Amino acid sequence: SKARVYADVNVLRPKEYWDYEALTVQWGEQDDYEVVRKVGRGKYSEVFEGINVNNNEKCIIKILKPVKKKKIKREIKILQNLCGGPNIVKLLDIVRDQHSKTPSLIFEYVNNTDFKVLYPTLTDYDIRYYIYELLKALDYCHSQGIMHRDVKPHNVMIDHELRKLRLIDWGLAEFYHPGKEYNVRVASRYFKGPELLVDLQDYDYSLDMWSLGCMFAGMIFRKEPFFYGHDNHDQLVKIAKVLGTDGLNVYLNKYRIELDPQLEALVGRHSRKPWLKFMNADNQHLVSPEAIDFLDKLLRYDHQERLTALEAMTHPYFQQVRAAENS
Numbered sequence: 619s620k621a622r623v624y625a626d627v628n629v630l631r632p633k634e635y636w637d638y639e640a641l642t643v644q645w646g647e648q649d650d651y652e653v654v655r656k657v658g659r660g661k662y663s664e665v666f667e668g669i670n671v672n673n674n675e676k677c678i679i680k681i682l683k684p685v686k687k688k689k690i691k692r693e694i695k696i697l698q699n700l701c702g703g704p705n706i707v708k709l710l711d712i713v714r715d716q717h718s719k720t721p722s723l724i725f726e727y728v729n730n731t732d733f734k735v736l737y738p739t740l741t742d743y744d745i746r747y748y749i750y751e752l753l754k755a756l757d758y759c760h761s762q763g764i765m766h767r768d769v770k771p772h773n774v775m776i777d778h779e780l781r782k783l784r785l786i787d788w789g790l791a792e793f794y795h796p797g798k799e800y801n802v803r804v805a806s807r808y809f810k811g812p813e814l815l816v817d818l819q820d821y822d823y824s825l826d827m828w829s830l831g832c833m834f835a836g837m838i839f840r841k842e843p844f845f846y847g848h849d850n851h852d853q854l855v856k857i858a859k860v861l862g863t864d865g866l867n868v869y870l871n872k873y874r875i876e877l878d879p880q881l882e883a884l885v886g887r888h889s890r891k892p893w894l895k896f897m898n899a900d901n902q903h904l905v906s907p908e909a910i911d912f913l914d915k916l917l918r919y920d921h922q923e924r925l926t927a928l929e930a931m932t933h934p935y936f937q938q939v940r941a942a943e944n945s
């Protein structure tokens with residue numbers, strides 16, 4: 619299996635573009651930035667709203683937790699490669715934390731509102747608008763030979779007041795190389811694509827499109843997460859109970875994959891559940907035929923069948939968003 623688009627991006631670019639291990643970091647001064655207040659926390663880093671004490675400019679300080687040098691050179695390299703792209707967080711500086719010596723990444727500030735509080739207030743148009751902005755970021759990174767691999771609401775910062783969106787946390791992102799087998803333990807469980815759950819390791823940019831679909835499904839149906847599995851095996855079960863097992867069988871046969879005995883049993887046999895069956899009084903204001911058609915073209919077992927970010931942006935669902943830009 620190989621990407622249907624941007625497959626040769628890294629082939630045509632100099633080795634130094636994608637050879638992140640050769641990266642030698644040029645450090646800045648830690649004392650230039652000061653923690654104002656903590657805003658985020660993860661098992662891979664802590665995030666603080668900060669201030670540049672040289673000019674009173676706001677910024678975000680992401681202090682990484684001790685992890686392999688290679689993993690961090692990869693994130694820095696990808697951030698540097700993508701800097702400037704539409705709606706991608708911009709890395710401004712890299713410093714060593716006062717006490718632990720761990721690299722601290724300095725970013726442009728963003729006045730985010732957790733999605734659990736923000737999403738409930740988004741209107742039909744708001745969702746089209748923000749998803750469109752997110753697609754701009756995905757098509758961009760894919761066009762630059764990079765897979766995000768951890769697309770989810772938690773990694774999408776939105777300043778609702780300014781209607782500004784930024785795709786963050788590239789700590790799991792990787793360079794796409796045709797035929798390369800990647801680790802399936804990427805993304806968050808609820809946003810993992812079928813390929814990661816059945817062990818199809820030669821996946822590509824399309825993985826991000828499935829994750830986007832999960833995120834979108836949660837937004838229009840007000841059901842988050844949309845596929846709520848209790849573990850990786852159950853995650854596939856939850857997906858199969860919606861998309862149906864008939865489609866899963868075709869998919870597995872195409873890629874000559876055979877599920878191990880336990881998972882095959884857990885998955886069982888399920889008829890497909892029409893997207894409209896998810897519409898209720900809580901999400902009716904957001905479920906439209908165009909939204910469903912778009913969602914349907916993202917959530918496909920076969921990664922090769924999914925819309926590419928570029929194709930997704932042209933779907934009629936976003937026609938007003940495009941027209942507003944073109945005027």
Ligand SMILES: Nc1ccc(N)c2c1C(=O)c1c(O)ccc(O)c1C2=O
Pocket residue numbers: 657658659665678680707725726727728729730731775784786787
């Ligand atoms: N990792 C980041 C890179 C750039 C950013 N601008 C941000 C982040 C965050 O993690 C982040 C967060 O966890 C909570 C609130 C926020 O406002 C941000 C944020 O603004």
